[PDB]
């Protein structure tokens, strides 16, 4: 509810000290956006050389272990991606200490709607709600100034009728789907441009941030291109090349493709594993696989030349890469492939597509790495976080490729198993919504991570619906290996075929909390996201039955 620059000067005044500082910025959690945000944030701190503590939090339940344990001198705290949904004032408590409260916890979140207790009643925040939903948002505005603090019998009856009158519309609010308005990174950059830093790798961090989520909607991002492209116009390494030159040597616009790993993998394998194309062309089917080859017969690209790594393909095919696709792809309905994208060239190393980089980092997060076992695993993810954090750095590229050799493999897993599902037609159309469960599969170790099931779930909800009449219906998935029937189940959102009228607001967040409040059968919201929960095989089936009814949508 504040100016970004002024919130900045506040976090400046409470900061400096000695033995300074002290602030712990919480990077959270598994979302690439977090990295994108906190890296340019951390670089900004290093600019004024302000000491910081940076914590890789996984579990939402895990945050309590930290904040309740170690805090001493820390008067100014910062947090990322948490608290937009569940309020930490009740969760942490707080317990006001010393107006002009000593500690300011900044909470940065893209999630909506905000918790009601957060924005109004200033204690721990210093909210980041600005500027996306301001709004009004008159529904939260009347939620308090009316409620607080609230012949005489008719005035009591009138008063109470008014109270429930506000409580109904208030109940409409805060019970709702969790949907990201704008990427937190973008706003950190809006905060950053007011201070005056135009830095190139910074901007690349923004591009990374925005393009973190295009796998899932945009939704506003379709109109974020002005806010990026203009900035790309606010700077330039050289008016003209001047090949290369070995330095600056920076990012530029190119006809990029939702196509998967075009530059770091072989072309044919790049269609065959791509996510948008696995749908429209029915590639899980042997009968459709051929249709790809017909694409190549249309392009005049040899099959043998399609099998070869993209660095080494002939030059003629490169110069025709932006034409041939126009000549052909239009006929297959694949006409939405070509985006205007961002590509940063490091020169003699190669170039990297904005999206593919994100595929590298995601790749890093799950691989390349009774409560003791889950804690130890979540711990392994915590360590792995930094292995992924390092790849963002420019000076070490040598491990970034270790991401990509993984990012390929994962797909080779994901695709494979994905097909293993469609052969058995495991989809249960049900009535109100679509649902699935993986009872058996190869290498569930890869599927342990929330984000792995976010991408498999994504390639599957994308596959089932082209569309593909009728009625985009949200999907459900489940997997188990070890940790005694943890059976991780993540919520999902429907995918429109590039024509998106409504955000549609994932409802699993609410539907799960209704069940936690009913019989709560081995239901665990331990994962940071409201869409993804844990379950046991003993209680999963009654849970599934209680999921089927009553349907909130």
């Amino acid at each position: 509810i504040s100016q970004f620059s002024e919130a900045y000067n506040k976090i400046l005044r409470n900061s400096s000290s000695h033995s300074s500082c002290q602030l712990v910025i919480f990077v959270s959690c598994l979302n690439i956006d977090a990295l994108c945000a906190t890296k340019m944030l951390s670089l900004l701190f290093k600019k004024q050389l302000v000491q910081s503590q940076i914590v890789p939090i996984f579990g939402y339940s895990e945050l309590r272990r930290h904040y309740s344990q170690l805090d001493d001198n820390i008067n100014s705290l910062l947090l990322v991606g948490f608290g937009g949904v569940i309020d930490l004032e009740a969760f942490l408590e707080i317990d006001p200490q010393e107006q002009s409260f000593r500690r300011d916890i900044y909470v940065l979140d893209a999630h909506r709607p905000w918790n009601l207790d957060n924005i109004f009643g200033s204690q721990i925040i210093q909210c980041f709600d600005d500027g996306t939903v301001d709004d009004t948002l008159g529904e939260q505005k009347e939620a308090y100034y009316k409620l607080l603090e609230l012949n005489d019998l008719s005035k009591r009856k009138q008063r109470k009728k008014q109270i429930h009158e506000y409580e109904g519309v208030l109940e409409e609010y805060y019970s709702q789907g969790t949907t990201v308005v704008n990427s937190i990174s973008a706003q950190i950059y809006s905060l950053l441009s007011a201070i005056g830093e135009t830095n190139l790798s910074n901007l690349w961090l923004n591009i990374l941030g925005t393009t973190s989520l295009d796998i899932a909607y945009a939704q506003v991002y379709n109109r974020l291109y002005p806010l990026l492209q203009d900035e790309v116009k606010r700077l330039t390494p050289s008016s003209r090349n001047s090949v290369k030159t070995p330095d600056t040597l920076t990012l530029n616009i190119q006809p990029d493709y939702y196509l998967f790993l075009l530059r770091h993998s072989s072309l044919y394998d790049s269609f065959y594993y791509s996510n948008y194309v696995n749908a429209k062309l029915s590639l899980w089917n042997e009968n459709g696989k051929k249709r790809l080859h017909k694409m190549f017969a249309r392009m005049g690209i040899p099959l043998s030349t399609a099998q070869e790594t993209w660095l080494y393909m002939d030059h003629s095919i490169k110069r025709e890469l932006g034409i041939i696709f126009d000549k052909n792809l239009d006929r297959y309905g694949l006409q939405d492939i070509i985006r205007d994208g961002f590509v940063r060239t490091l020169g003699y190393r190669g170039s990297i597509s904005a999206s593919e980089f994100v595929e590298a980092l995601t790749a890093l997060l799950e691989v390349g790495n009774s409560a003791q076992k889950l804690t130890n695993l979540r711990k392994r993810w915590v360590s792995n976080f930094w292995l992924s954090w390092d790849a963002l750095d420019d000076r070490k590229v040598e491990l970034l490729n270790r991401g990509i050799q993984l990012a390929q493999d994962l797909q080779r897993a994901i695709f494979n198993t994905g097909v293993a599902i469609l052969e058995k037609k495991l989809i249960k159309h049900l009535r109100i919504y679509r649902l699935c469960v993986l009872q058996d599969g190869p290498d569930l170790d890869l599927y342990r991570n929330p984000l792995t099931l976010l991408r498999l779930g994504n390639w599957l909800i994308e596959c089932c619906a082209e569309s593909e009449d009728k009625q985009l219906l949200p999907m459900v998935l489940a997997s188990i290996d070890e940790n005694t029937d943890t059976y991780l189940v993540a919520g999902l959102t429907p995918r429109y075929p590039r024509g998106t009228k409504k955000p549609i607001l994932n409802n699993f967040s609410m539907a799960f909390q209704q069940i936690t409040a009913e019989t709560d059968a081995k239901v665990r919201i331990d994962n940071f996201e409201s869409s993804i929960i844990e379950i046991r095989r003993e209680d999963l089936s009654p849970f599934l039955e209680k999921l089927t009814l009553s349907g909130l949508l």
């Binding site: 051929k290 249309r298 005049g300």
Partner: protein, 241 residues
């Protein structure tokens, strides 16, 4: 002859809009198949060609040599209209031409079979390894491209020459079908392009190749007479059958 060009104008009509089994052109679907497979062998049934007209079928039993060269260029034309490409893929497709009775076996052959496409059948005997043949000649200059040959080469530069794999396989007549008191005579078989490696020793194979001679070749020492060699330049390959 130039008149033969007009024949092309006919056979192209046979190549695409010809239908059978209630619609659904078969040769259109073959061109579509390779096509996607891009295996560069277009396959034309003799039954259908003979069904449309006996005049071309008669041309197959008279002079296959130059007519296949007339024909496959048109096949390349049909693939060109169906897939406006493959200027970059192989730029030649030589047609396979399925069963063509005849059905002369082995030991029954005469001079009457010269220059005329003839089916043969029998067991394969151990085959030579794959040694790229010269075919087309090209250089940066520096005369022009010189096709040589099948098989003379009279009367070398190289820069970028288009090689095509050669393989010579000796086809012996099937042991079961041998008339008593007779030895299993056998003939030389010359495979080309994709037909290579399709064969394996020990197996019976059905070949459509045309028959050839040249060129004495080499005896002139123990014969007594001007006797040519007998070599079947192969066309298609199929398992038995």
């Amino acid at each position: 002859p130039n008149v033969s060009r007009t024949i092309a104008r006919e056979l192209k009509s046979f190549l695409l809009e010809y239908t059978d089994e209630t619609g659904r052109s078969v040769y259109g679907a073959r061109i579509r198949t390779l096509g996607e497979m891009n295996s560069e062998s277009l396959e034309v049934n003799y039954r259908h060609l003979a069904e449309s007209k006996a005049i071309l079928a008669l041309f197959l039993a008279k002079c296959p040599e130059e007519m296949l060269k007339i024909f496959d260029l048109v096949a390349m034309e049909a693939t060109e209209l169906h897939y406006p490409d493959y200027a970059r893929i192989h730029s030649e497709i030589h047609v396979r031409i399925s069963d063509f009775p005849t059905i002369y076996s082995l030991r029954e052959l005469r001079e009457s079979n010269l220059s005329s496409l003839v089916r043969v059948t029998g067991v394969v005997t151990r085959r030579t390894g794959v040694f790229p043949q010269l075919k087309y000649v090209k250089f940066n200059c520096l005369l022009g491209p010189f096709f040589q040959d099948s098989n003379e080469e009279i009367r070398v530069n190289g820069e970028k020459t288009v090689y095509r794999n050669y393989q010579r396989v000796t086809l012996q007549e099937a042991p079961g079908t041998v008339p008593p008191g007779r030895l299993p005579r056998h003939r030389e078989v010359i495979l080309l392009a994709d037909l290579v490696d399709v064969s394996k020793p020990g197996e019976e194979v059905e070949v459509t190749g045309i028959y050839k001679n040249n060129y004495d070749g080499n005896l002139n020492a123990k014969n007594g007479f001007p006797v040519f060699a007998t070599i079947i330049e192969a066309n298609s390959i199929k398992r038995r059958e």
